Amino acid sequence: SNLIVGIDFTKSNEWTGAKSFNRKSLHHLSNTPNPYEQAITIIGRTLAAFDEDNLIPCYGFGDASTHDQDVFSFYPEGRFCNGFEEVLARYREIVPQLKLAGPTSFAPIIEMAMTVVEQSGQYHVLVIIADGQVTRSVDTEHGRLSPQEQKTVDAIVKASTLPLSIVLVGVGDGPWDMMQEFDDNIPARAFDNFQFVNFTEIMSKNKDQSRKETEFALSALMEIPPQY
Amino acid sequence: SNLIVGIDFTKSNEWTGAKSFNRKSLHHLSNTPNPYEQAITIIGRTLAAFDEDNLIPCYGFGDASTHDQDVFSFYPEGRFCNGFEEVLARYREIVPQLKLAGPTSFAPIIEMAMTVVEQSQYHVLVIIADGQVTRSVDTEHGRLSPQEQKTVDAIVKASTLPLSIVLVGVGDGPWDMMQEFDDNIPARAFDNFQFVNFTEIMSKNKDQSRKETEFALSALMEIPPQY
Ligand SMILES: [Ca+2]
Ligand SMILES: [Ca+2]
Ligand SMILES: [Ca+2]
Ligand SMILES: [Ca+2]
Ligand SMILES: [Ca+2]
Ligand SMILES: [Ca+2]
Ligand SMILES: [Ca+2]
Ligand SMILES: [Ca+2]
């Protein structure tokens, strides 16, 4: 198995840390690791074993350079991060230059993972670290969903015929209704290829750190098919 | 959720380590951990992370004091173990005092687990065992040995509670009967019994941490989708 990492850089990260991060942006850099740093770090400690070559494709999405249309690679060319040590380091280099934007769709990151799978038909797990706030639609002229939620669901459906599992690592306050829906209720799906894990909730419990980290890791891999 | 542990102390453990443990008893104490200790330790590092309060009801069964009728608590007035570090330490304290015996049945441990569930919110019962439940050729017992029949009956009755049973198999096997409890019990409300071959998983030559997670994911594989 190999890992793929996508990181949400949309503007909603500015306010989804109201309760869980003392009204600082989830991407704020300072004396203490923000929830994205914490997740990258713990993923490195607990899930990195499930990447066979320890090379990690990392992508960002939803900043002003990509909006809801594209992703960007952490490194020029098709060059990958060497371990989650470098994932974290590169995140910290990149964050100060980014203008957080939107709208929010998972279509571009899921399409990028589909391309990674075809560059390999080997099994992959895509890990998206995100605040859960995909663009919502209040409008009957739009149709049922926002175009972002429609495109995202369509990408999740298209990916479900590939050897790919998706894991949403949720950081911040939520709400988590949309992620829980992607987790449990996408009907046109070939198989259940989306798992939601509430990282911020798990890490806030009164248990030993190492037990919290293990609870996170197993919750993350809980829907990975039997055959692995 | 909450994790309950039951450990098999029947006499078959004296021979079910013939291949996997170089002809030593599976409960042999030394300066290297036996398969029960290996399993306790890995369960503590993995599955036990979910236990809400880190207090773990622990029981043994199948020694001379309980035979196929009862379990014994690791601690006097049913005091729970404080974390899996204490589960392991207490196991090591207890084993030298036990006379391994029989017959072998899972009815007592499953009945105890039901009692625990009823007094409590999801539970996982982990039974660490060599798989050798008492068999019989004699059909004056009915189709199954009294032990196997009472065990099946307990599994079925437990299936109406928020409880999943995971058999952590240690030693050589054979694993036919565990696979049957895993896959083939008719009157059951839901599939509440999973078999994991721990000795087979851990004997593979790969990264230790990946083996442990693979073990954990197998143990949790049949938890109902709700969780
Ligand atoms: Ca957003
Ligand atoms: Ca890789
Ligand atoms: Ca799911
Ligand atoms: Ca789920
Ligand atoms: Ca407990
Ligand atoms: Ca036995
Ligand atoms: Ca089963
Ligand atoms: Ca099974």
Short mmCIF file of C-alpha atoms in Angstrom, two decimals, chain B:
data_model
loop_
_atom_site.label_atom_id
_atom_site.label_comp_id
_atom_site.label_asym_id
_atom_site.label_seq_id
_atom_site.Cartn_x
_atom_site.Cartn_y
_atom_site.Cartn_z
CA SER B 1 -16.41 1.35 24.65
CA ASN B 2 -14.90 -1.16 27.06
CA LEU B 3 -12.62 -4.19 26.69
CA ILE B 4 -12.96 -7.45 28.61
CA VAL B 5 -10.19 -10.09 28.71
CA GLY B 6 -10.47 -13.85 29.25
CA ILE B 7 -7.47 -16.19 29.30
CA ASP B 8 -7.49 -19.96 28.68
CA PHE B 9 -5.62 -21.90 31.38
CA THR B 10 -6.49 -25.43 30.25
CA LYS B 11 -4.03 -28.30 30.06
CA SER B 12 -3.96 -28.43 26.23
CA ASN B 13 -1.69 -25.37 26.37
CA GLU B 14 1.01 -27.85 27.39
CA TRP B 15 1.09 -29.32 23.88
CA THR B 16 -0.39 -26.71 21.50
CA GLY B 17 3.00 -24.94 21.36
CA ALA B 18 4.80 -27.94 19.85
CA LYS B 19 5.74 -26.17 16.62
CA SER B 20 5.17 -22.49 17.31
CA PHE B 21 6.90 -22.45 20.69
CA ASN B 22 9.51 -25.20 20.31
CA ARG B 23 7.77 -27.84 22.39
CA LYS B 24 7.38 -25.56 25.42
CA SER B 25 4.05 -24.94 27.20
CA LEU B 26 2.24 -21.87 25.88
CA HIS B 27 2.13 -20.64 29.50
CA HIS B 28 5.85 -21.33 30.09
CA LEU B 29 7.42 -18.46 32.07
CA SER B 30 10.97 -17.40 31.24
CA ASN B 31 13.03 -14.37 30.26
CA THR B 32 11.31 -14.25 26.86
CA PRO B 33 7.55 -13.72 26.60
CA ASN B 34 5.34 -16.74 25.79
CA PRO B 35 2.56 -16.39 23.19
CA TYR B 36 -0.03 -15.36 25.81
CA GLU B 37 2.25 -12.56 27.01
CA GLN B 38 2.98 -11.50 23.43
CA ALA B 39 -0.74 -11.30 22.76
CA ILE B 40 -1.53 -9.46 26.00
CA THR B 41 1.17 -6.91 25.26
CA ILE B 42 0.09 -6.28 21.65
CA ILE B 43 -3.60 -6.12 22.58
CA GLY B 44 -2.62 -3.49 25.17
CA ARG B 45 -0.75 -1.47 22.52
CA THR B 46 -3.59 -1.65 20.01
CA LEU B 47 -7.20 -2.65 20.75
CA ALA B 48 -7.04 -1.46 24.34
CA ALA B 49 -6.55 2.12 23.15
CA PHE B 50 -10.35 2.28 22.71
CA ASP B 51 -11.19 1.33 26.29
CA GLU B 52 -12.93 4.40 27.74
CA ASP B 53 -11.43 4.33 31.26
CA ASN B 54 -8.37 2.02 30.87
CA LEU B 55 -9.87 -0.23 33.52
CA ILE B 56 -9.96 -3.80 32.21
CA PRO B 57 -12.01 -6.68 33.64
CA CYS B 58 -9.72 -9.73 33.41
CA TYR B 59 -10.58 -13.36 33.99
CA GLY B 60 -9.01 -16.79 33.71
CA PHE B 61 -10.69 -20.14 33.12
CA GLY B 62 -9.92 -23.83 32.82
CA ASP B 63 -7.54 -24.26 35.75
CA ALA B 64 -8.21 -26.73 38.56
CA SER B 65 -10.28 -24.21 40.53
CA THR B 66 -12.85 -23.53 37.77
CA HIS B 67 -12.70 -26.45 35.32
CA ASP B 68 -15.36 -25.90 32.64
CA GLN B 69 -17.86 -24.33 35.03
CA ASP B 70 -16.56 -20.95 36.12
CA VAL B 71 -14.05 -18.17 35.64
CA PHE B 72 -11.83 -16.50 38.24
CA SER B 73 -11.15 -12.79 38.39
CA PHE B 74 -7.53 -11.65 38.22
CA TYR B 75 -8.27 -9.67 41.39
CA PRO B 76 -10.33 -10.45 44.58
CA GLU B 77 -13.60 -8.52 44.77
CA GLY B 78 -13.77 -8.35 40.98
CA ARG B 79 -11.45 -5.33 40.96
CA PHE B 80 -10.57 -4.42 37.36
CA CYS B 81 -6.98 -4.28 36.09
CA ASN B 82 -5.55 -0.79 35.75
CA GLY B 83 -4.28 -0.78 32.17
CA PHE B 84 -2.69 -3.59 30.20
CA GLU B 85 0.64 -3.14 31.98
CA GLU B 86 -1.15 -4.51 35.03
CA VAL B 87 -2.88 -7.16 32.92
CA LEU B 88 0.53 -8.52 31.94
CA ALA B 89 2.09 -8.19 35.40
CA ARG B 90 -0.84 -9.92 37.06
CA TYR B 91 -0.83 -12.72 34.48
CA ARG B 92 2.83 -13.41 35.33
CA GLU B 93 2.02 -13.41 39.07
CA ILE B 94 -0.89 -15.82 38.63
CA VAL B 95 0.44 -18.48 36.24
CA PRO B 96 2.94 -20.15 38.62
CA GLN B 97 0.09 -20.74 41.10
CA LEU B 98 -2.34 -22.34 38.64
CA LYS B 99 -2.84 -25.98 37.89
CA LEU B 100 -3.81 -26.17 34.20
CA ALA B 101 -6.84 -28.41 33.80
CA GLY B 102 -10.17 -28.67 32.03
CA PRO B 103 -12.46 -29.50 30.35
CA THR B 104 -12.36 -26.49 28.02
CA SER B 105 -15.48 -24.34 27.45
CA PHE B 106 -16.05 -20.66 26.58
CA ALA B 107 -19.48 -20.63 28.20
CA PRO B 108 -18.25 -19.30 31.57
CA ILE B 109 -16.22 -16.42 30.14
CA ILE B 110 -18.97 -15.41 27.73
CA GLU B 111 -21.53 -15.57 30.57
CA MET B 112 -19.27 -13.37 32.68
CA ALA B 113 -18.89 -10.90 29.80
CA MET B 114 -22.69 -10.74 29.47
CA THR B 115 -22.95 -9.94 33.17
CA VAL B 116 -20.42 -7.14 32.72
CA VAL B 117 -22.28 -5.76 29.67
CA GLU B 118 -25.64 -5.87 31.47
CA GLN B 119 -24.24 -3.94 34.45
CA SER B 120 -22.86 -1.15 32.26
CA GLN B 121 -22.11 1.33 25.39
CA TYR B 122 -20.17 -1.21 23.34
CA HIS B 123 -18.02 -4.04 24.66
CA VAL B 124 -15.38 -6.27 23.08
CA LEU B 125 -14.53 -9.55 24.78
CA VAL B 126 -11.08 -10.74 23.88
CA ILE B 127 -10.53 -14.45 24.57
CA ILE B 128 -6.89 -15.49 24.34
CA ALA B 129 -6.78 -19.25 23.82
CA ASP B 130 -5.20 -22.18 21.99
CA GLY B 131 -8.47 -23.03 20.27
CA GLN B 132 -8.87 -26.47 21.83
CA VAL B 133 -12.42 -26.58 23.15
CA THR B 134 -13.35 -30.06 24.44
CA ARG B 135 -14.61 -32.35 21.67
CA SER B 136 -16.45 -35.66 21.87
CA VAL B 137 -17.12 -38.70 19.69
CA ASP B 138 -19.98 -39.77 21.96
CA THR B 139 -23.43 -38.84 20.64
CA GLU B 140 -25.15 -39.68 23.90
CA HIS B 141 -24.16 -36.04 24.56
CA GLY B 142 -26.18 -34.99 21.54
CA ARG B 143 -24.40 -33.83 18.40
CA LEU B 144 -21.78 -31.77 20.28
CA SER B 145 -19.74 -32.18 23.46
CA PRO B 146 -21.31 -30.57 26.51
CA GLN B 147 -18.56 -27.93 26.32
CA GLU B 148 -19.03 -27.14 22.65
CA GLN B 149 -22.84 -27.11 23.02
CA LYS B 150 -22.82 -24.81 26.05
CA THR B 151 -20.29 -22.61 24.23
CA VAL B 152 -22.47 -22.34 21.10
CA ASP B 153 -25.48 -21.62 23.31
CA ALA B 154 -23.60 -18.82 25.07
CA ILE B 155 -22.46 -17.26 21.76
CA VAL B 156 -26.05 -17.23 20.50
CA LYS B 157 -27.41 -15.78 23.75
CA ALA B 158 -24.67 -13.12 23.84
CA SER B 159 -25.58 -12.07 20.26
CA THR B 160 -28.51 -10.00 21.58
CA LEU B 161 -26.18 -7.65 23.47
CA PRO B 162 -23.83 -4.83 22.40
CA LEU B 163 -20.85 -7.19 22.57
CA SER B 164 -18.35 -8.48 20.02
CA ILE B 165 -16.21 -11.53 20.77
CA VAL B 166 -12.72 -11.83 19.42
CA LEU B 167 -10.79 -15.06 19.74
CA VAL B 168 -7.10 -14.28 19.76
CA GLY B 169 -5.58 -17.60 18.78
CA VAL B 170 -2.14 -18.51 20.08
CA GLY B 171 -0.08 -21.65 19.41
CA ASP B 172 -0.34 -24.29 16.65
CA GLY B 173 -4.07 -24.92 16.42
CA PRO B 174 -5.84 -26.73 14.77
CA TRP B 175 -8.25 -23.85 14.24
CA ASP B 176 -11.27 -25.70 12.77
CA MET B 177 -13.55 -25.16 15.77
CA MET B 178 -12.71 -21.44 16.11
CA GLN B 179 -13.36 -20.96 12.38
CA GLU B 180 -16.73 -22.58 12.93
CA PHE B 181 -17.58 -20.23 15.83
CA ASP B 182 -16.39 -17.40 13.55
CA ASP B 183 -18.37 -18.32 10.44
CA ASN B 184 -21.06 -20.88 11.19
CA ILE B 185 -23.48 -20.43 14.08
CA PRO B 186 -27.16 -20.54 12.90
CA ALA B 187 -29.41 -19.19 15.67
CA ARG B 188 -27.26 -16.04 16.02
CA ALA B 189 -28.74 -12.49 15.99
CA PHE B 190 -25.66 -11.04 14.29
CA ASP B 191 -22.11 -12.26 13.56
CA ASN B 192 -20.66 -11.59 17.04
CA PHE B 193 -17.60 -13.87 16.91
CA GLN B 194 -14.31 -13.16 15.13
CA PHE B 195 -11.28 -15.47 14.93
CA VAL B 196 -7.78 -14.00 14.61
CA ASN B 197 -4.77 -16.26 14.23
CA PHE B 198 -2.29 -14.21 16.27
CA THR B 199 0.57 -16.71 16.05
CA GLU B 200 0.28 -16.74 12.24
CA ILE B 201 0.06 -12.94 11.94
CA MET B 202 3.09 -12.29 14.17
CA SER B 203 5.31 -14.99 12.63
CA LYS B 204 5.44 -13.07 9.34
CA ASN B 205 8.74 -11.36 8.60
CA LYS B 206 7.95 -7.68 8.20
CA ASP B 207 7.88 -4.43 10.16
CA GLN B 208 6.75 -5.08 13.73
CA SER B 209 4.47 -2.04 13.84
CA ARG B 210 2.66 -3.07 10.66
CA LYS B 211 2.11 -6.59 12.04
CA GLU B 212 0.59 -5.12 15.21
CA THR B 213 -1.77 -2.86 13.29
CA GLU B 214 -2.72 -5.75 10.98
CA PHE B 215 -3.52 -7.81 14.04
CA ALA B 216 -5.64 -4.95 15.44
CA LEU B 217 -7.53 -4.38 12.20
CA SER B 218 -8.27 -8.12 11.95
CA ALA B 219 -9.54 -8.16 15.53
CA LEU B 220 -11.80 -5.21 14.77
CA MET B 221 -12.82 -6.37 11.30
CA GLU B 222 -16.29 -7.65 12.29
CA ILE B 223 -17.30 -4.83 14.62
CA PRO B 224 -20.77 -3.84 13.35
CA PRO B 225 -20.68 -0.87 10.89
CA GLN B 226 -22.37 1.41 13.46
CA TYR B 227 -18.92 1.67 15.11
#
